[PDB]
Amino acid sequence: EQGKISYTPITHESTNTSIHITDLKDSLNEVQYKIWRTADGKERAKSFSSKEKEKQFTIPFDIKEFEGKRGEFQIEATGMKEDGKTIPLTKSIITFEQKVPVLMYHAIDDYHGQGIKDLFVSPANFEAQMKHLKDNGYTLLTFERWGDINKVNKPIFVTFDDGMKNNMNAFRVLQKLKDDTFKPAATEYMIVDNVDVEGALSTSEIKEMVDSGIFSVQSHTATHADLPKITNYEEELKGSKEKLEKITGKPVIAIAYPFGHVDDKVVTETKKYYQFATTTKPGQFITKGEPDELLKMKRVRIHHTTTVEQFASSIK
Ligand SMILES: [Zn+2]
């Protein structure tokens, strides 16, 4: 191989770059760049040609060429020599960060006054919302697959706060929609000291959820503590993690801050035991390389009266 692909640096806001190639030994009348998204696969590659040696075979690359789809792009360069032969040159990777909606659900039930109205999404609505994700080719992830957000199409994280029994309704809907094409996954943030108490998930229910492969069960602290206000951080953060890990049989790496209450101190303590933390601040996540950004993740709130159309717009 003879290589060194170079491109102009990008940020999370970039939509274009300039790609050229240097350190060539052979003389070429043409170089082809084959470019494809890892999520789509080699079969959906698009090709670009440059016959300009003096400009180091520069090409403009813009994601409008892929209908504004972002993520990881693989670049494969080949050249045609002066003797008619086509040779391999080199390969490279460029990654346009994609946005990641993190959905916040709480209770999945019809409302009978059994809590905060806005926190209840009906089974019919929930099914409609999940079917919209299925039909439009969203890839439902959990935090164990964080490394894949730029390698899949339309990544999204469905999350549930508290560990309510009615989240078994969500489990049944997700099971029912599963098939060869659609592999649902979701994250449940459990109040760990509520395991096996009335109205909360039992140990056997949690185990069924995890064993199915659909749910990743993660921390919501031990007692749903107001984190900025307490000092028993080891107990609420590390203790909830460890207790929950023996229930699930799988690592606990994520937390949701109760009440959405967080400050610099809470982040400092959380970082000792968790890799990912979600707030209740509205918005979609994108990787910017800001300090501790994985521990201050925004979420998209779904409301009692949210229609599929409102839902769809909130995640685009
Ligand atoms: Zn909560």
The full set of domains in the chain, from first to last, is 1-97 (2.60.40.3760), 98-316 (3.20.20.370)
Structure tokens at 253: 């790496």
Ligand 1 ion: nearby residues, β-carbon < 5 Å: 161-162
Q: Give φ, ψ of 71 to 5 degrees.
A: 100, -160
Calculate how far, in angstroms, residue 300's C-alpha sits from the geometric centre of ligand 1. Answer: 15
Determine the Cα angle at 136 with ends 133 and 152, to 5°.
85
Alpha-carbon distance of 220 to 192, in angstroms, equals 7
Select from 74, 65, 66 the least CA-distant residue to 95.
Answer: 74
Map tokens 């400050």 to a residue. Answer: 263
Q: Which residues pair with 41 in a beta bridge?
A: none
Structure tokens at 124: 């019919």
Structure tokens at 296: 């201050």
Calculate how far, in angstroms, residue 71's C-alpha sits from the geometric centre of ligand 1. Answer: 32
Calculate how far, in angstroms, residue 288's C-alpha sits from the geometric centre of ligand 1. Answer: 27
Instruction: Compute, in degrees rounded to 10, the torsion defined by CA atoms 285, 272, 143, 148.
Output: 70
Q: Which residues pair with 47 in a beta bridge?
A: 34
Calculate how far, in angstroms, residue 194's C-alpha sits from the geometric centre of ligand 1. Answer: 12
Alpha-carbon distance of 273 to 252, in angstroms, equals 9
Calculate how far, in angstroms, residue 259's C-alpha sits from the geometric centre of ligand 1. Answer: 6
Q: Give φ, ψ of 131 to 5 degrees.
A: -65, -35
Structure tokens at 27: 């003389």
Alpha-carbon distance of 240 to 222, in angstroms, equals 5
Calculate how far, in angstroms, residue 162's C-alpha sits from the geometric centre of ligand 1. Answer: 5
Calculate how far, in angstroms, residue 224's C-alpha sits from the geometric centre of ligand 1. Answer: 6
Identify whether the C-beta of residue 256 lies closer than 8 Å to the C-beta of residue 217: no
Calculate how far, in angstroms, residue 161's C-alpha sits from the geometric centre of ligand 1. Answer: 5
Structure tokens at 288: 């910017």
Calculate how far, in angstroms, residue 256's C-alpha sits from the geometric centre of ligand 1. Answer: 8
Select from 240, 266, 267 the least CA-distant residue to 253.
Answer: 240
DSSP string, the chain: ----EEE----TT--EEEEEE----S-EEEEEEEEEETTT-GGG-EEEEE--TTTTT-EEEEGGGGTT--EEEEEEEEEEETTS-EEEEEEEEEEEPPPB-EEEE-EES--SSSS-GGGEE-HHHHHHHHHHHHHTT-EEE-GGGGGGTTTSSSEEEEEEEE-BTTHHHHHHHHHHH-SSS----EEEEE-GGGTTSTTB--HHHHHHHHHTTSEEEEE--SS---GGG-S-HIIIIIIHHHHHHHHHSS---EEE-GGG---HHHHHHHTTT-SEEEEEEES-B-----TTGGGSEEEEEPPTT--HHHHHHHT-
Burial of 125 (0-12, 13-18, 19+ CB in 10 A): buried
What letters, b where the CB count within 10 A reaches 16 and e where it falls short, cover 191-201?
Answer: bbbbbeeeebb
Calculate how far, in angstroms, residue 160's C-alpha sits from the geometric centre of ligand 1. Answer: 9
Binding site residues, as ranges? 162, 220, 224
Calculate how far, in angstroms, residue 190's C-alpha sits from the geometric centre of ligand 1. Answer: 8
Binding site residues for Zn(2+), as ranges? 162, 220, 224
Select from 38, 77, 72 the least CA-distant residue to 58.
Answer: 77
Resolved by:
X-ray
Alpha-carbon distance of 210 to 218, in angstroms, equals 11
Burial of 235 (0-12, 13-18, 19+ CB in 10 A): middle
Q: With both helix axes pointing from N to C terminus, report the angle between 167-177 and 203-211 in degrees, rounded to the nearest 10.
A: 20
CA 144 vs. chain centroid, Å, equals 10
Calculate how far, in angstroms, residue 164's C-alpha sits from the geometric centre of ligand 1. Answer: 10
Alpha-carbon distance of 296 to 231, in angstroms, equals 20
- Report how far apart, in Å, the C-alpha atoms of 86 and of each of 22, 27, 74, 250, 282 are: 18, 12, 20, 50, 52
Q: Give φ, ψ of 241 to 5 degrees.
A: -55, -55
Q: Is the backbone of residue 203 left (phi > 0), alpha (psi -120 to 50) or beta?
A: alpha
